[PDB]
Amino acid sequence: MDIPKITTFLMFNNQAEEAVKLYTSLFEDSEIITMAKYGDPGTVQHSIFTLNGQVFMAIDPISLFVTVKDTIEMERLFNGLKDEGAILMPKTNMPPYREFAWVQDKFGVSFQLALPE
């Protein structure tokens, strides 16, 4: 269950269980490894799935979800990407993460920065 440093992260309306079901079914070496719904209820809070043995995540724009090594990795990527960027959410201690941030960079790509601890 080892997730890449950078995971493509798909966010849906309330369509994640279907989207996942759809892609999992088409692509070959693929499998739902984790789904957690909300207690909007019945919606996906957290999914980790495979497509050709590659790890994706979905919940509920189509961001990059970065698992950070350190407080210091966080600092660097945060400050690097935040330039002329939007901060969707700033550095925040957010269980189950030591820290988490959400930045759109100047060109428009969303990065989620997640420090596990």
Side-chain angles (χ1 to χ4, degrees), residues 1-4 6-59 61-68 70 72 74-83 85-97 99-116:
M1 317 66 205
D2 75 286
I3 74 161
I6 294 151
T7 297
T8 300
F9 199 94
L10 309 71
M11 277 191 55
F12 312 80
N13 266 73
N14 296 289
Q15 302 192 93
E17 185 168 49
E18 344 166 12
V20 171
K21 193 224 70 181
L22 179 62
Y23 306 145
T24 272
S25 301
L26 299 175
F27 292 74
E28 274 195 23
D29 163 30
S30 79
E31 184 183 11
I32 281 168
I33 112 82
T34 277
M35 267 227 176
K37 320 301 210 81
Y38 288 121
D40 279 8
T43 295
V44 174
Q45 176 175 209
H46 179 235
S47 204
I48 295 176
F49 59 100
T50 289
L51 301 186
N52 293 273
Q54 296 172 51
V55 185
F56 288 83
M57 292 175 188
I59 69 179
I62 164 173
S63 75
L64 297 170
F65 173 102
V66 190
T67 300
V68 178
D70 284 334
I72 312 76
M74 276 271 33
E75 264 305 90
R76 307 210 174 108
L77 265 48
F78 184 84
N79 298 321
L81 299 172
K82 137 263 281 6
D83 209 280
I87 289 123
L88 318 179
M89 174 182 317
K91 283 136 320 158
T92 302
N93 177 191
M94 171 166 116
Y97 297 119
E99 187 161 20
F100 175 86
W102 199 359
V103 189
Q104 185 163 77
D105 62 34
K106 58 170 78 122
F107 309 100
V109 183
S110 286
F111 290 86
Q112 301 181 59
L113 324 176
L115 204 162

